[PDB]
Amino acid sequence: DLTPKVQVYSRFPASAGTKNVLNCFAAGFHPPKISITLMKDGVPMEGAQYSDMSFNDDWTFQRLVHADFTPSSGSTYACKVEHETLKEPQVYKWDPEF
Amino acid sequence: ELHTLRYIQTAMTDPGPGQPWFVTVGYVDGELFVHYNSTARRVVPRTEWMAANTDQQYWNGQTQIVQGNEQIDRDDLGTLQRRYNQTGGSHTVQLMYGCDILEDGTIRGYSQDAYDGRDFIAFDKGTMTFTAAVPEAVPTKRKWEEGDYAEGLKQYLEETCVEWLRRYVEYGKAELGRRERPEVRVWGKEADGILTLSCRAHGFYPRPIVVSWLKDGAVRGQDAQSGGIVPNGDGTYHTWVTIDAQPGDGDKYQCRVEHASLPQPGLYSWE
Amino acid sequence: SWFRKPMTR
């Protein structure tokens, strides 16, 4: 009904050793209170920037969380999302595609 | 040429931890240009074309227009709780207003309000009356109609909104009207006798994009799953389209990307 | 420019 639809992706096509930005976008959620955290191997990804909160015509909220990172082989990158509509915290794994 | 100006307002009782209770932003053609929060208490630009074209007089003046709205929403959070007979808890007041300059020259003005994600007061520009969606919106409807506040709001959406939007478009002519080429990557994954072909587009501008999967030169629609158009932190956009196929048919599949930056639709494959 | 709200709800 009002659960957040989460997508994990990179700014530029992923390459090992090359500088990139890891984005986590959640949309279609209400109430606005949300906990979106970018994680590297099950631990938060240092200095993450939280973009200005927005909502569409149906009054459902959306938020983007981005952080500068260097993708490395053998490291698992994921996004932890906590919301009132969800019973348990949802973890979304990032597919490196390389 | 289509040009839109949208201003959204959010008043919260449960932000919650380390977050501002009052957040409000502006949009020019879907791009974030102005921001205000209850913690900082100052209007800060979000685009380079906005800061370089406006003076200190404008930034100081805009802050007080919002500061007054912050006070109004602070009182309204308490006023609406008494009407619905609520002691406390998580409550949100949302406001959406703006003007749209259509391709046919028609100017569309709108002003909508909501309480806890459900419609409250919607302004009707034609009848010059505030429409009530809930029975708790009737005292607001009665108050806003006697005082003729609809005349000042109609003056804004038709005159003030259009004049400023036309100036903002002129300030960011090179930024809003730019063409940014997307970086397309095609990757396949085989599991349980199903080959999933993923087509991902990175960092394109403007927002409209048509990504379609083709098999033997013919488009395959119903089988394709998309995640829509998602944004990036630098103002660019992202999208992904996946298709389920039989193993040993990957070479027959081709991803077609239709964008304004590309002169002809780009054809990509897993190679 | 933001609209200055002329009245409370």
Residue numbers in the entry:
A (entry chain B): 1 to 98
B (entry chain A): 1 to 271
C (entry chain F): 1 to 9
Extract from the study:
Highly polymorphic class I molecules encoded by the major histocompatibility complex (MHC) are crucial in the adaptive immune response to viruses and some intracellular bacteria, binding peptides inside the cell and presenting them on the cell surface to CD8 T lymphocytes. In contrast, chicken TAP genes are highly polymorphic, with each haplotype encoding a TAP molecule with a peptide-translocation specificity matching the peptide-binding specificity of the dominantly expressed class I molecule encoded by the BF2 gene, with the BF1 gene expressed poorly or not at all. In this paper, we find that two other haplotypes known to confer resistance to Marek's disease also have low cell surface expression and promiscuous peptide motifs, and examine the structural basis for promiscuous binding in three low expressing molecules. Second, we show that peptide-binding repertoire and level of cell surface expression are inversely correlated in both chickens and humans, indicating that this relationship is a fundamental property of class I molecules.
The B14 peptides all share two features, generally a medium to large hydrophobic amino acid at P2 and one or more basic amino acids at the end of the peptide. A wire model of BF2*1401 shows small hydrophobic and polar residues in and around the beginning of the groove and reveals many acidic residues at the end of the groove, well placed to interact with the basic residues at the peptide C-terminus. The crystal structure of peptide SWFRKPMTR bound to BF2*1401 shows that Trp at position P2 interacts with hydrophobic surfaces in pocket B, while Arg at Pc interacts with Asp73(human position 74), Asp76(77) and Asp113(116) in pocket F. Both these pockets are much deeper in BF2*1401 compared to BF2*0201, which explains the larger anchor residues found in the B14 peptides compared to most B2 peptides. The differences in pocket sizes are primarily due to difference in size between Val43(45) and Tyr43(45) for pocket B and between Asp113(116) and Met113(116) for pocket F, which are supported by a network of hydrogen bonds from Thr24 and Gln9 in BF2*1401 and from Asp24 and Arg9 in BF2*0201. Structures of BF2*0201 and BF2*1401 show promiscuous binding via hydrophobic binding pockets for the anchor residues at peptide position P2 and Pc, with the class I residues at positions 24 and 9 playing supporting roles, and with residues lining the pockets explaining the relative size of anchor residues. In BF2*0201 and BF2*1401, the two Ser residues are replaced by the large residues Asn69(70) and Tyr97(99), creating a constricted groove much more like narrow grooves found in high expressing fastidious molecules such as BF2*0401. However, analysis of BF2*0201 and BF2*1401 shows promiscuous binding by chicken molecules using anchor positions into pockets B and F, much like many mammalian classical class I molecules.
